[PDB]
Amino acid sequence: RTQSYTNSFTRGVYYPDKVFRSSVLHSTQDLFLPFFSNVTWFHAIHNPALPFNDGVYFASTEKSNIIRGWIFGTTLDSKTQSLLIVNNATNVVIKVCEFQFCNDPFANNCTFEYVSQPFLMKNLREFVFKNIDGYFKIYSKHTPINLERDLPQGFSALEPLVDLPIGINITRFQTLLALHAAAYYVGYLQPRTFLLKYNENGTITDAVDCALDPLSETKC
Amino acid sequence: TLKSFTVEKGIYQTSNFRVQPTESIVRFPNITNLCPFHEVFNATTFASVYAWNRKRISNCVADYSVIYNFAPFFAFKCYGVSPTKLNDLCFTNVYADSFVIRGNEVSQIAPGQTGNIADYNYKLPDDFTGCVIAWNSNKLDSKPSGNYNYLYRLFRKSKLKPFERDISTEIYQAGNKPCNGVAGPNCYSPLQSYGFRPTYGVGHQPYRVVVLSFELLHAPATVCGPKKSTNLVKNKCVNFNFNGLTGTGVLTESNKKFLPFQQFGRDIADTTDAVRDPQTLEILDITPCSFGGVSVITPGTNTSNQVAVLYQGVNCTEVNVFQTRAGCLIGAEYVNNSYECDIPIGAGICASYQTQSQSIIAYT
Amino acid sequence: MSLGAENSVAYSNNSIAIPTNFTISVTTEILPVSMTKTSVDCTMYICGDSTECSNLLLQYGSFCTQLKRALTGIAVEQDKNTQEVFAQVKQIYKTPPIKYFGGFNFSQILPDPSKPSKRSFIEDLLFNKVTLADAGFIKQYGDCLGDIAARDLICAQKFNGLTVLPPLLTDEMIAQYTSALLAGTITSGWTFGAGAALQIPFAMQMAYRFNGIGVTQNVLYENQKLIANQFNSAIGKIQDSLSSTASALGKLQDVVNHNAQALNTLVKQLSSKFGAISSVLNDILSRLDKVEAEVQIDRLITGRLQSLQTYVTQQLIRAAEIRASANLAATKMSECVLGQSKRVDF
Amino acid sequence: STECSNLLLQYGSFCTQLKRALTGIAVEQDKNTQEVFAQVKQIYKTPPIK
Amino acid sequence: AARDLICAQKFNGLTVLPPLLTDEMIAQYTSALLAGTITSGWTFGAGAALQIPFAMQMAYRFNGIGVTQNVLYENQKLIANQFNSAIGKIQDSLSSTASALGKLQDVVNHNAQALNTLVKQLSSKFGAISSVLNDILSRLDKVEAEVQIDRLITGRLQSLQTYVTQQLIRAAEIRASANLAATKMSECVLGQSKRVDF
Numbered sequence A: 001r002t003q004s005y006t007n008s009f010t011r012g013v014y015y016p017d018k019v020f021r022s023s024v025l026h027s028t029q030d031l032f033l034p035f036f037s038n039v040t041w042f043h044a045i046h047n048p049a050l051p052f053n054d055g056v057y058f059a060s061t062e063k064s065n066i067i068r069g070w071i072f073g074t075t076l077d078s079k080t081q082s083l084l085i086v087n088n089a090t091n092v093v094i095k096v097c098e099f100q101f102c103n104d105p106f107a108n109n110c111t112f113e114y115v116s117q118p119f120l121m122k123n124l125r126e127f128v129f130k131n132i133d134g135y136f137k138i139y140s141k142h143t144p145i146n147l148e149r150d151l152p153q154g155f156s157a158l159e160p161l162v163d164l165p166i167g168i169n170i171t172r173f174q175t176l177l178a179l180h181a182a183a184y185y186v187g188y189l190q191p192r193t194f195l196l197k198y199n200e201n202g203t204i205t206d207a208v209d210c211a212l213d214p215l216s217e218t219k220c
Numbered sequence B: 001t002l003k004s005f006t007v008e009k010g011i012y013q014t015s016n017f018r019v020q021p022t023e024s025i026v027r028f029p030n031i032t033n034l035c036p037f038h039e040v041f042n043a044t045t046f047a048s049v050y051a052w053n054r055k056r057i058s059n060c061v062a063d064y065s066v067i068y069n070f071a072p073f074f075a076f077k078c079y080g081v082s083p084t085k086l087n088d089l090c091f092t093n094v095y096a097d098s099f100v101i102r103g104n105e106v107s108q109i110a111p112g113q114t115g116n117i118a119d120y121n122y123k124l125p126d127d128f129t130g131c132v133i134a135w136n137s138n139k140l141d142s143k144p145s146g147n148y149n150y151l152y153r154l155f156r157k158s159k160l161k162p163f164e165r166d167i168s169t170e171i172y173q174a175g176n177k178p179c180n181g182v183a184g185p186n187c188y189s190p191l192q193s194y195g196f197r198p199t200y201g202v203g204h205q206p207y208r209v210v211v212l213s214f215e216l217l218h219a220p221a222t223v224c225g226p227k228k229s230t231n232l233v234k235n236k237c238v239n240f241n242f243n244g245l246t247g248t249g250v251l252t253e254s255n256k257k258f259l260p261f262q263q264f265g266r267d268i269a270d271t272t273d274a275v276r277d278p279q280t281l282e283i284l285d286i287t288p289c290s291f292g293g294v295s296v297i298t299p300g301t302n303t304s305n306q307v308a309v310l311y312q313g314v315n316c317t318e319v320n321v322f323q324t325r326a327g328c329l330i331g332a333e334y335v336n337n338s339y340e341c342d343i344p345i346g347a348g349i350c351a352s353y354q355t356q357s358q359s360i361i362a363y364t
Numbered sequence C: 001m002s003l004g005a006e007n008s009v010a011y012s013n014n015s016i017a018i019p020t021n022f023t024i025s026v027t028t029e030i031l032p033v034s035m036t037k038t039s040v041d042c043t044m045y046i047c048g049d050s051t052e053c054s055n056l057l058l059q060y061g062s063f064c065t066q067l068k069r070a071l072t073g074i075a076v077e078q079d080k081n082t083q084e085v086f087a088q089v090k091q092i093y094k095t096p097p098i099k100y101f102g103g104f105n106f107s108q109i110l111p112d113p114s115k116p117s118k119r120s121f122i123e124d125l126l127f128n129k130v131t132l133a134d135a136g137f138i139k140q141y142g143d144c145l146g147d148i149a150a151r152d153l154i155c156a157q158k159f160n161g162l163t164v165l166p167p168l169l170t171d172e173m174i175a176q177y178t179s180a181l182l183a184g185t186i187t188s189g190w191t192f193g194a195g196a197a198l199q200i201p202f203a204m205q206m207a208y209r210f211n212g213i214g215v216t217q218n219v220l221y222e223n224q225k226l227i228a229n230q231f232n233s234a235i236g237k238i239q240d241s242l243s244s245t246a247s248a249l250g251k252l253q254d255v256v257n258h259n260a261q262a263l264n265t266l267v268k269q270l271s272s273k274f275g276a277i278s279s280v281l282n283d284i285l286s287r288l289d290k291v292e293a294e295v296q297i298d299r300l301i302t303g304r305l306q307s308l309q310t311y312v313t314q315q316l317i318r319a320a321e322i323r324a325s326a327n328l329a330a331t332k333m334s335e336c337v338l339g340q341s342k343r344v345d346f
Numbered sequence D: 001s002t003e004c005s006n007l008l009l010q011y012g013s014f015c016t017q018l019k020r021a022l023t024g025i026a027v028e029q030d031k032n033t034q035e036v037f038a039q040v041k042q043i044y045k046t047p048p049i050k
Numbered sequence E: 001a002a003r004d005l006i007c008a009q010k011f012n013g014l015t016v017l018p019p020l021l022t023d024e025m026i027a028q029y030t031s032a033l034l035a036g037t038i039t040s041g042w043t044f045g046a047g048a049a050l051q052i053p054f055a056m057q058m059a060y061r062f063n064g065i066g067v068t069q070n071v072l073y074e075n076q077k078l079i080a081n082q083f084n085s086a087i088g089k090i091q092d093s094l095s096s097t098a099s100a101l102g103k104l105q106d107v108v109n110h111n112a113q114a115l116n117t118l119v120k121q122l123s124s125k126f127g128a129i130s131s132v133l134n135d136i137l138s139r140l141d142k143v144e145a146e147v148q149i150d151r152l153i154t155g156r157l158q159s160l161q162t163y164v165t166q167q168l169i170r171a172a173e174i175r176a177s178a179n180l181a182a183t184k185m186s187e188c189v190l191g192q193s194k195r196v197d198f
C-alpha cells in the first residue's frame, strides 16, 4: 500500500463524559489526540497491520462508500476474539466470534449484536476507539467537509456511541476493503490535559491543549 | 443568638427562613422483570480462577434481600456502597463474577492488593465500587482423593490489567533455551491444580467467591431496585428521588438542549442543575426553594419589647409592609420626614423608635 | 531599564536661575475608600439543608459565630469608612444661580438637574468607566428563580449562602456630599471647614491662594484671563484623558475584581472531594450507612471550614488595607479640599 | 511523588491562592521600592568643582 | 561536607526571587536626589531644577524656621565647621557602634527564620508513622499509605498556610513603613517641613 504523512490540524476532540455543561471551561485529563501531530495517511491500492497503542483515531473522506468495516484483535486469525461489522443500508450488526480470516479480508463471551441505522448516513467520517479497564469505547461524528484536500480546520466534537461490557487485550487492527481507491488517516492517542469550552447550547466549540507550546500552558 | 437576656438598640442578624418541602416524589423507570441472582448464587459448579465467568445483569429489578437466603455466607463485604442501602438507589449495569479460590487467598480479592491471584489470575480496579461474597464449599467442592477440576495460574511474563481474562495454555519458559512444546528442563505448566481434600485445615478450604461490580449512573438506568413510583408535579417545593438522587427543590419545565446521550446537567459548584425524567423523555430544572436571611430591628429591652423584621433581599410575596432596596420591612411604618440615622437598615433607610403611642418608624 | 534622562545642572557660586512664567496643572489622584460587604451562611454553605450535616456541625463549637462576627465587623467598617471620608461637611451648600467665578469654568464638575441622579460630567465618566460585577444586593432572587439561558455566577453564589449587602449611603447621597463640598469650596474658600462659611469673590480667593505659596497677589490680577484660560484648557485635557485612557482607574477595578474572584473561588471550592468519596452530601448519605457517611461528612465539613476560614482571614487583611487607604483619603479631603497644603508632594 | 500529587489534586485550589498571595507580596515589594526611591524624573549630576 | 541552609531551602521548593532594581540603580537614584538637593534646593521637586548658591539656599533654610538670614552670613565658617564635625561624628559612630541598624537586620532575620521553620516542619510526623514519604510507600499497601499520605498532606498544608498568613501580615507592616519612608522622602528631602518632631 501507499504511506504518507499529514499534520493533524487541531482535530479529534470529544465529549469526555455524559453530563450537560453550558457556558463553562472544563479541564479534563484523558487519552486525547495531541494538537498538530503526525497522522499517517494510508492509500489502499495494493497488507500488514498496525499496532494498537492507547487507542487510535480514524478519519475517512470517502464519498464513494467503500469502507464497510473495522477489524480488531491480537493475532487476527481465530483464537482471541476479533470485532467484525457489516455495513449496508439495513443493519450494523456486530460479530465478535471467530471466522479464521484470510490475509486480505475484502469461543468466548461478549457476543454483542446491534441492529440500528447505518453508520455511513463531501463527507468526513471520524472515529475514536479506546480501551480502558476492560471497557471499549467508540466515538463518531459526521462532518460535511467542503474543501476536500486534507483534514479541515475547526472543532467538531465526537459523540460517544458504543461502550462494550468486556473485551480482550488488543494490540493490532486492520481495515476492510471493497472490490467489485481507499484512503484513511490514522492517529494515535496520548494521555493529555485539555481545556474545553462549552457554549450556551452545551456543545464543545473550542479546546486548548496544555502541553503544546508555553502559550497554551499559560492559557491552561 | 446573643446569649443574653437584654439586647441593645441595633439590628441583629438572627437566622434564615426557608420554605419546607410539602411532597415526596420517587421517579423510577418502568420495569417488570426480576434479576436472576438464583442462577449466580446457586449453581452446580463454578468456573476456575483463570477463566472466571462474568454475567451481565441488566433490564430487571434487583432485590438484594434474597442473597442471604440463597447462599450461607457471613459478611456481605462491600467497598464503595453499603449493604443496607442497596434497595434504595440504583445503577446502570451489574456484573457478577464467579469463581472458587483457596481459603488462604481470599484477602487478595481487594483493590490495591498484590500476590498470586491479584497479579496473574484476577485483578480488581483501584476505583472498585462493589461487593465481594465468599462462602464455604467443603461439602460441594472437596474430594478425599483430591479435587482436580480447579486450576490456577501462577507463571506469567507480566502483570494483569484490571478485569482482564487469560485462557491461553502455553508452556511457560524461564530461560534462554526454548521449550518447543516439551515440558523439559526449565519448562513449566502455568496452570496447577488445587487438590482440595476434606482433611486440610480451615485455611486451605475452598471458598466460593462472587464479586458484584456496580457502575455509577452515566447512562439511562436500566437495573433498579424495588421502589414505587409517584406522579410528577411541577412548580412546587418537593423532595425528589430521581434514580437515586435525593434532593429538595422546585422542578420547572426548561428549554435546555440536552444531547440524546446525556442524562444530567451540572453546575459550577458540582450541583445538579437539570435532570431527565426516567419514564418519559422530559427535561426538568431543579431550583432550591425560596430562602433569605432575617434581621431583627429593635430598640433596647430596657426601652421596649417591640421588634421589626427585615427580610433580606427578597421581593416579599413569599413570606405595615415597606419595600426597601435591602429586602422588605415588616412592623415599621414609613413616614415622609427626614431625621438623622438611628438604626441603619439598607440603601438610605434608617429606623428609629419615635412617638410620631410609641412605635418603630422607618424613614430616609 | 532606564532610570531617566541624564541632566547636568550648571551650578556656580554666583549664578541663579529664576522663572519668568507659569503653568496651571490639574492632576488626578484615585483612592479606594470602601469595598463590597458580604455575608456567609454556614448552614447553607457547608451543609445545604442536610440535617445530618447540621447535627455534625454543632459539635465543632462556635467557629461560624465568630466568622459571622468578623464579617459583620467588616461590613460595619466599610460604611464607617465611607461616612468618615465623605461626611465631613455639616450642611449642604448650594451654588448661586449666576455662574460667574472670575472666568473659571466649573461646568464639568458641578451637577446638572436634567438627569435624575445628580452627577456631573466627570463623575459620569468615572462611573461609566469602572464596570461593576453586578453583585446581588439588588433583589435578584426573582431573576434567579426564573433562570434564563445558562445559570449566572451570581445565582450560583446566592444559592450557596454567599450574599452581598447594599451600602448604607447610595450614590445619590455621595453625589450630594460631593456637590456640597464643591459649592463650599468655590463659594467660600477654606472658611467653611473651620466654622461658618464666609462668602468671597473667587478672584480674591485665588489671590489668597497665590499669596500662600510666596507669589505676590499682583501676579494674579495682571494675568487673570491667562490663568482662567489655562484652567479651562486643563479641564478640557482631563475630560479628554478620561475619555481616552481606560487604565487610569485600575485601583477601583482591582477592588471590584478581588472581591469577585474571592467569591468565585469560594463557590468553586465546593466541588473538591477533600479526600472523601464524593463532593455531594446526598450521594454520601444515600450510598453509605451511618458510620461511614459520618466519617466522609466529617472530612467534607473540615475541608469547607478550612476554606471559609481562609476566606475570612484574607478578607480581614484586605479590610485593613482598605481602611488605611480610607484614612489617607479622609486626611486628603480634610487638608487638600478644606484648606491649602504646605506639604511637598502632598 | 506521583501518588502524593494524585491525592493532592483532590484538595482543591489552595495552591493557586497561595501562589497568588505570594505573587502579590512579590510585586508589592517592587512597588514599595519604586514609590520610595523613584521620585525624580531626571538623573542629575554634581559639577566637577566640589 | 554539611548541607547549607540555602541549599536545603532551595531543594524543597522555597526559592528567593531577586528585586527588580539593582543596588547600582538605587545608588544612582540616591545620587540624583543628593545632587538635586545640594544644587537646586526644593525647586527640583516642583518642576524644573533651578540652580542657586548653597550659602543662599542655607540662608533661605534659616529664614524658613524664623531666624533672620544675616545670622548665617555672619557665622558661615562656624556653621560649616559644625556641619563637618557632625558628619565626622556620624562616620565614627557608624564605624564603632553597630547596633543602630537593628531594624533592617530584623527585616532580614525574620525572613530567614520563618523559612527555617518551613524546613523543620518537613521533619514532623503529624500523627503518621513516618515523616519520609518513600518509606510509607515502601512499607505499606494502597489504603494505609493513602491514610498516612492524607495526614502528611493536611499537616504540610496547615504549616504552609500559616507561613503565607504571617508573610501577608509582615507585608502589611512593611508597606506601612514604606509609605512612611516615601512621605519622609517627599517632605524632608524635597522641601522644608514645619511639622514638629518630623
Ligand SMILES: *[C@@H]1O[C@H](CO)[C@@H](O[C@@H]2O[C@H](CO)[C@@H](O)[C@H](O)[C@H]2NC(C)=O)[C@H](O)[C@H]1NC(C)=O
Pocket: C021, C022, C023, C226, C229, C230
Ligand atoms: C506664559 O505662558 C503662556 C502659555 O502657558 C503664554 O500664553 C500664550 O501666548 C501666546 C503668544 O503668542 C499665544 O499664542 C498663546 O495662545 C498663549 N497661550 C495661552 C494658553 O493663552 C504667555 O504668553 C507666556 N507669558 C509670556 C510673558 O510670554
Ligand SMILES: *[C@@H]1O[C@H](CO)[C@@H](O)[C@H](O)[C@H]1NC(C)=O
Pocket: A005, A006, A007, A037, A038
Ligand atoms: C512525521 O514523521 C516523519 C518521519 O520521517 C517525518 O518525515 C515528518 O516530517 C513528520 N511530520 C511532521 C513533523 O509534520
Ligand SMILES: *[C@@H]1O[C@H](CO)[C@@H](O)[C@H](O)[C@H]1NC(C)=O
Pocket: A199, A200, A201
Ligand atoms: C444555539 O442554537 C441555536 C438554535 O440552533 C442557534 O440559533 C444559536 O446560534 C446556537 N448558539 C451558538 C452556536 O453559540
Ligand SMILES: *[C@@H]1O[C@H](CO)[C@@H](O)[C@H](O)[C@H]1NC(C)=O
Pocket: B030, B031, B279, B280
Ligand atoms: C413506560 O412508560 C412509557 C411512557 O409512559 C411507555 O411509552 C412505555 O411503553 C412504558 N414501558 C412499559 C414496559 O410499561
Ligand SMILES: *[C@@H]1O[C@H](CO)[C@@H](O)[C@H](O)[C@H]1NC(C)=O
Pocket: B038, B042, B043, B069, B070, B071
Ligand atoms: C439450587 O438449585 C437446585 C436445582 O434446582 C435446587 O434443588 C435447590 O433447592 C436450590 N437451592 C437453593 C438454596 O436455592
Ligand SMILES: *[C@@H]1O[C@H](CO)[C@@H](O)[C@H](O)[C@H]1NC(C)=O
Pocket: B315, B317, B323
Ligand atoms: C419587585 O420589587 C420592585 C421594587 O419596586 C417592584 O416594583 C416590583 O413590582 C416587584 N416585583 C413583583 C412584585 O413581582
Ligand SMILES: *[C@@H]1O[C@H](CO)[C@@H](O)[C@H](O)[C@H]1NC(C)=O
Pocket: C013, D049
Ligand atoms: C567661586 O567660583 C570660581 C569659579 O569656579 C572659583 O574660581 C572661586 O574660587 C570661587 N570662590 C571661592 C571663594 O572659592
Ligand SMILES: *[C@@H]1O[C@H](CO)[C@@H](O)[C@H](O)[C@H]1NC(C)=O
Pocket: C105, C107, C108, C236
Ligand atoms: C464654559 O462656560 C460657558 C458658559 O459661558 C459654557 O457654555 C461652556 O460650555 C463652558 N465650557 C465647557 C467646555 O463646558
